[PDB]
Design a protein. Structure first.
Lengths: 100, 84, 99, 138, 208, 125
RNA sequence: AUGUGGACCCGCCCCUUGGGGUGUGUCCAAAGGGCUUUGCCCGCUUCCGGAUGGGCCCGCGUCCCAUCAGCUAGUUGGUGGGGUAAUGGCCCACCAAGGCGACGACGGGUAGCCGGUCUGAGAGGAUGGCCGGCCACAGGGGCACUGAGACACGGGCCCCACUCCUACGGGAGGCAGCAGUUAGGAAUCUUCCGCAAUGGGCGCAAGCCUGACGGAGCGACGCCGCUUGGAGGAAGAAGCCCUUCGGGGUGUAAACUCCUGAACCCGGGACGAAACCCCCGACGAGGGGACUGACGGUACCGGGGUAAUAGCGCCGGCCAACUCCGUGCCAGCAGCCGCGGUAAUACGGAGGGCGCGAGCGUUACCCGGAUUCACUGGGCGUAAAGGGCGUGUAGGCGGCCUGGGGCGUCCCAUGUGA
């Protein structure tokens, strides 16, 4: 079966393309604590509908482009700029790690 | 073509083939798709030959091709004796 | 001092030119139809595309071009020549096209 | 605040026992409950009674022990020789029905939250489940 | 190859007769009778308390020195035993006893296992009609060990075969004295021979 | 620590430093003698131990110990290095194998001839 | 030229990311050779299937240094093109200004990955050598051609490095194939036999090729099996060790007496081989009949038949095995603790003893012991270890009740797990 994933949009700043942020929970191989992770995907929106916050689903697809192999499936829960902010501050805080 | 042939096993001076299907360009002890019975050419045991005779014809149906010394051990298993 | 199946390469030399020669003709002819289909002359155009079409497949039987390549050629070709003749042109013949 | 209430319960008992008291009061939950219960069903405790204290609900838990021994230190054996949290918020412990304890060779008892609830090693095996191992007791 | 030379030093040293010669180790004088004290210049001197290791050591060798085999062949059997079922230890004796050359000693075809071996090695012994010249053969139930034809006679068999008329051969054993043949019947339980050894310690030793 | 920390770092894996780096995972290493002399060991005792300074393959020049009683080593003498310090003499971390190359075995040694590169003598006649 | 049939543009049809169906228009096929010849066989061309082998893509997993913290111009997306068996920024235009990173980008160091393998109670740790699966390279690089298939070890062009031949008139080569040589190294073999068998290529088939393979050769390198004997044999010689000079030890050991008998000599002698082919039947099903063994006169079988190599380590404690002598902080031992200073069970030899045995030691390395990186399974008052003290970002963690969702988690079934 084609992979099915669920995540938040953080970028609409590409033409007819977007960036979906996927989480996953699971235990640590040795320490068993249940932990999270993240992967960004470049999702295809051939009709730039989806936008910032659109908690959506995407699906493994034939190579639309380099880096870009997921089409959007469907909206699930639009308007979630709260989750988006997490990704934002986290990337912001990166500046205060500049080895100076 | 794909084939059915003698894949050597056992030891030095102690042959013990494994009757098998694979690509004619695989190694003669290389990876195979499915084993169909054994063959000690030294008759050191009652069970010195065995086939899953159904599968044997199945691969033969689709287009397998045994050897000049693999049919002999399948002719000797009524694969060819085709009733009336 | 060596294998005399070096012919296999010398064989390639002929097969090289032979199938190369046909291949130049394919495009130089394919050239024509395109230019013409752009200058309204939809008559002489579809005389070439019809010739184009035959030139390809005729080599496709052999060992030159094969597979969906002829298709990929012919497609994008009449996918284009016709999409040029939209400039009035008038389908002077369906003599290539199932219009 | 209490990061873990379940641990706090167990720990409250363990503290109470080591001074040999009648009862041990502890904040209430429908999940702390069906966790205790077993401790009466397996007779580790006398039992409890849902009561209220200062307008707030608690669970007076009544402690079993053993015989007034003799010799110096006549203090009786405990019923509860040992009890400790396993799955924790710092590290949650889940197990398949196979991967399941043999606490003190049958003499001990694990306690787990499962798709059918607060089973034991013995039960969960027989119902064929396994789940979040809460604690071990003997 | 095997141990060769001074044997009677070993009925002693271990400090316990282990009947390793022919009739001598059975006759009034088995290297111990006269001198039941350890070999060498330091013989008639008072021993110091052994180490636990020392205790375990002596017990192992004893057993091996009894069956008289390489440390090579010996330990394989222990691990084999150590790997197997349940008791996975005491069973050991069963594996030791299944040795062809061992059996032949019990079957009284010879008197020393050393004498037994030279027979098997010279192939004067047969199994189920088969010329078997390998002293390591793990025999099993119902297998039959008999003198071959070229050797049914031989001065060395007759008297060695004869003198067996007296004693009840092992429960796991049987012998057509006239027919020159025997049957391995079963696996000798620990009961079936209280060897002068405490096999518990050999185990303890080998788990170094 | 705590478990969170364990994910953040893990536990560090010790590592193990060699004590025979002049060899490079080799059982031995051939060399050439530069100096051959005697030295005084750690106060603990006292004597005049025979050690050679050896220039080997890998440009290296290390002090190697000469064991037993007497030898046949002037300066330019091919040698073979073993491995194993002396403890008495600081700095020396390597032995010389006897009876190999220009260094020969111990004359009239009857016991531990496995070392000391001494061949078995004739006992009868 | 024929057109079953296929491809391409537009249409509707269903289906749905270029799948299927059809409408019209236009393009596409070829091959003959041999006969128990007038009939069959080996081939030819189109299409759909099947099966096998793949190409591309995706999720998750995969080393050390943060004393590498910022990286990026085809960079990221778009549009349209070029290209391929086909997706794609794979390449090219143009447009947009994006894409990545403390969940460790970028940089540096090491490494072919796995099934496995070694150790370990386990959890782990270590490792990838032979065998098997995949990737990668073929002197160093680049490139394409032919082709179903390669950018091709023993095919081709070019550049470089290197070596060789030559009347020098100029040209030639690519062992990481099999052996073998050199050099390097502590160290790794025969320039052997045969296609008899298995497998592979060609052919209708005989048959041909096969340093794949089947064997042989060299090396205690490893594992395993076996021998240098067995029974007897003294109150127990000689010699050699101690000795309180009475004796004790080596020691049933030898001798010696019987018995067997590794080797070697003679004879015989394989399995591994049954098919391809041949007869009848239709060369199919079938019975049937026939050739071939490199290893090799080898193993094994029979008879005859000879008592026939033993070494190495250790014997202060850990650690099993003790005494004379020599030596006198010397010569020397040593894995740690330490032995040697004129009485050394610790050096050296000797006798004796312990331990393995065609082996015994040593060195180097991996795991164990080490619960000494501690998930299982540890600590931080004085032993090494609480940040000098706040505030707080991300992050981790979260009280009491009832619902929905069932993400984690739990069960069953099934496929996969070679
Ligand atoms: Mg292949
Ligand atoms: Mg046949
Ligand atoms: Mg091509
Ligand atoms: Mg057992
Ligand atoms: Mg000193
Ligand atoms: Mg001093
Ligand atoms: Mg020494
Ligand atoms: Mg035509
Ligand atoms: Mg269609
Ligand atoms: Mg043709
Ligand atoms: Mg002709
Ligand atoms: Mg392929
Ligand atoms: Mg561009
Ligand atoms: Mg484009
Ligand atoms: Mg495109
Ligand atoms: Mg291609
Ligand atoms: Mg990430
Ligand atoms: Mg890091
Ligand atoms: Mg690098
Ligand atoms: Mg490498
Ligand atoms: Mg692994
Ligand atoms: Mg294991
Ligand atoms: Mg194991
Ligand atoms: Mg593991
Ligand atoms: Mg690994
Ligand atoms: Mg290696
Ligand atoms: Mg290799
Ligand atoms: Mg491999
Ligand atoms: Mg080279
Ligand atoms: Mg090639
Ligand atoms: Mg090439
Ligand atoms: Mg390649
Ligand atoms: Mg070559
Ligand atoms: Mg070579
Ligand atoms: Mg050299
Ligand atoms: Mg070589
Ligand atoms: Mg070889
Ligand atoms: Mg062949
Ligand atoms: Mg063949
Ligand atoms: Mg053929
Ligand atoms: Mg012919
Ligand atoms: Mg040839
Ligand atoms: Mg050849
Ligand atoms: Mg070979
Ligand atoms: Mg050998
Ligand atoms: Mg050696
Ligand atoms: Mg005596
Ligand atoms: Mg004497
Ligand atoms: Mg004797
Ligand atoms: Mg005789
Ligand atoms: Mg013969
Ligand atoms: Mg043939
Ligand atoms: Mg037949
Ligand atoms: Mg026949
Ligand atoms: Mg002969
Ligand atoms: Mg004979
Ligand atoms: Mg003799
Ligand atoms: Mg004799
Ligand atoms: Mg030792
Ligand atoms: Mg030891
Ligand atoms: Mg001792
Ligand atoms: Mg004296
Ligand atoms: Mg003196
Ligand atoms: Mg002295
Ligand atoms: Mg003194
Ligand atoms: Mg010592
Ligand atoms: Mg000494
Ligand atoms: Mg001695
Ligand atoms: Mg000695
Ligand atoms: Mg811990
Ligand atoms: Mg500690
Ligand atoms: Mg603390
Ligand atoms: Mg201090
Ligand atoms: Mg401190
Ligand atoms: Mg403080
Ligand atoms: Mg602070
Ligand atoms: Mg500060
Ligand atoms: Mg917070
Ligand atoms: Mg929370
Ligand atoms: Mg909560
Ligand atoms: Mg499964
Ligand atoms: Zn005796």
């Amino acid at each position: 079966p084609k992979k099915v994933l669920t995540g938040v949009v953080v970028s609409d700043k590409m033409q007819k393309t977007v960036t979906v942020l996927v989480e996953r929970q699971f235990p640590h191989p040795l320490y068993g604590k249940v932990i999270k992770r993240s992967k960004k995907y470049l999702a295809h929106d051939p009709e730039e509908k989806y936008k910032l916050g659109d908690v959506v689903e995407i699906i493994e697809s034939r190579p639309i482009s380099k880096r870009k192999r997921f089409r959007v499936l469907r909206l699930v829960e639009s308007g979630r700029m709260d989750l988006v902010e997490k990704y934002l501050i986290r990337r912001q805080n990166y500046e205060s790690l500049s080895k100076r | 073509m794909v084939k059915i042939r003698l894949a050597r096993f056992g030891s030095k001076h102690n042959p013990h083939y494994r009757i098998v299907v694979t690509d004619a360009r695989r190694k003669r002890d290389g990876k195979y798709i499915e084993k169909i019975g054994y063959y000690d050419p030294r008759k050191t045991t009652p069970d010195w030959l065995k086939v899953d005779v159904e599968r044997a014809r199945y691969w033969l149906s689709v287009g397998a091709q045994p050897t000049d010394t693999a049919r002999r051990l399948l002719r000797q298993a009524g694969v060819f004796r085709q009733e009336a | 001092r060596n294998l005399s199946a070096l012919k296999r390469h010398r064989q390639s030399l002929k097969r090289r030119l032979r199938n190369k020669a046909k291949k130049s003709a394919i495009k130089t002819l394919s050239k024509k139809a395109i230019q013409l289909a752009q200058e309204g002359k939809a008559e002489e155009a579809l005389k070439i595309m019809r010739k184009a079409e035959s030139l390809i497949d005729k080599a496709a039987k052999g060992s030159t071009l094969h597979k969906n390549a002829a298709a990929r050629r012919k497609s994008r070709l009449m996918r284009k020549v016709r999409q040029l003749l939209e400039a009035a042109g008038a389908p002077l013949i369906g003599g290539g096209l199932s219009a | 605040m209490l990061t873990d209430p379940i641990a706090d319960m167990l720990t409250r008992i363990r503290n109470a026992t080591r001074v040999y008291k009648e009862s041990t009061d502890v904040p209430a939950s429908r999940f702390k409950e069906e966790i205790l219960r077993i401790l009466a069903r397996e007779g580790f405790i006398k039992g409890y009674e849902r009561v209220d204290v200062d307008g707030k609900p608690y669970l007076r838990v009544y402690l079993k022990y053993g015989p007034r021994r003799q010799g110096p230190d006549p203090r009786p054996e405990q019923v509860i020789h040992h009890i400790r949290r396993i799955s924790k918020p710092g590290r949650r412990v889940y197990v398949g029905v196979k991967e399941i304890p043999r606490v003190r060779r049958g003499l001990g008892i694990a306690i787990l939250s499962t798709s059918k609830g607060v089973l034991t090693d013995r039960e969960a095996r027989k119902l064929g489940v396994g789940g979040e191992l809460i604690c071990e007791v003997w | 190859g095997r141990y060769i030379g001074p044997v009677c030093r070993l009925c002693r040293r271990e400090g316990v007769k282990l009947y390793l010669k022919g009739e001598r180790c059975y006759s009034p004088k088995c290297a111990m009778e006269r001198r039941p004290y350890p070999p060498g210049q330091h013989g008639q001197k008072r021993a110091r308390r052994p180490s636990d290791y020392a205790v375990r050591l002596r017990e192992k060798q004893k057993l091996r020195r009894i069956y008289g085999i390489s440390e090579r062949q010996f330990r394989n059997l222990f691990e084999e035993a150590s790997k197997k079922k349940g008791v996975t230890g005491s069973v050991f004796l069963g594996l030791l006893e299944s040795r062809l050359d061992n059996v032949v000693y019990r079957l009284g075809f010879a008197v020393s296992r050393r004498q037994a071996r030279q027979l098997v090695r010279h192939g004067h012994i047969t199994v189920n009609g088969r010329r078997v010249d390998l002293p390591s053969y793990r025999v099993r139930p119902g297998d039959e060990i008999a003198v071959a034809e070229k050797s049914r006679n031989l001065e060395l068999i007759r008297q060695n075969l004869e003198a067996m008329k007296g004693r009840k051969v092992g429960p796991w054993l049987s012998l057509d004295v006239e027919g020159m043949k025997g049957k391995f019947l079963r696996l000798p339980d620990r009961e079936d021979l209280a060897l002068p050894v405490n096999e518990q310690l050999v185990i303890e030793f080998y788990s170094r | 620590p705590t478990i969170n920390q364990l994910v953040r770092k893990g536990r560090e894996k010790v590592r193990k430093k060699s004590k025979v780096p002049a060899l490079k995972g080799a059982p031995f290493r051939r060399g050439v003698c530069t100096v051959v002399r005697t030295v005084t060991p750690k106060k603990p005792n006292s004597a005049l131990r025979k050690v050679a300074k050896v220039r080997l393959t890998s440009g290296y020049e290390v002090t190697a110990y000469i064991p037993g009683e007497g030898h046949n080593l002037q300066e330019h003498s091919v040698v073979l290095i073993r491995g194993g310090r002396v403890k008495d003499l600081p700095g020396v971390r390597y032995h010389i194998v006897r009876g190999v190359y220009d260094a020969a075995g111990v004359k009239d040694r009857k016991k531990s001839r496995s070392k000391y590169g001494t061949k078995k003598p004739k006992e009868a006649a």
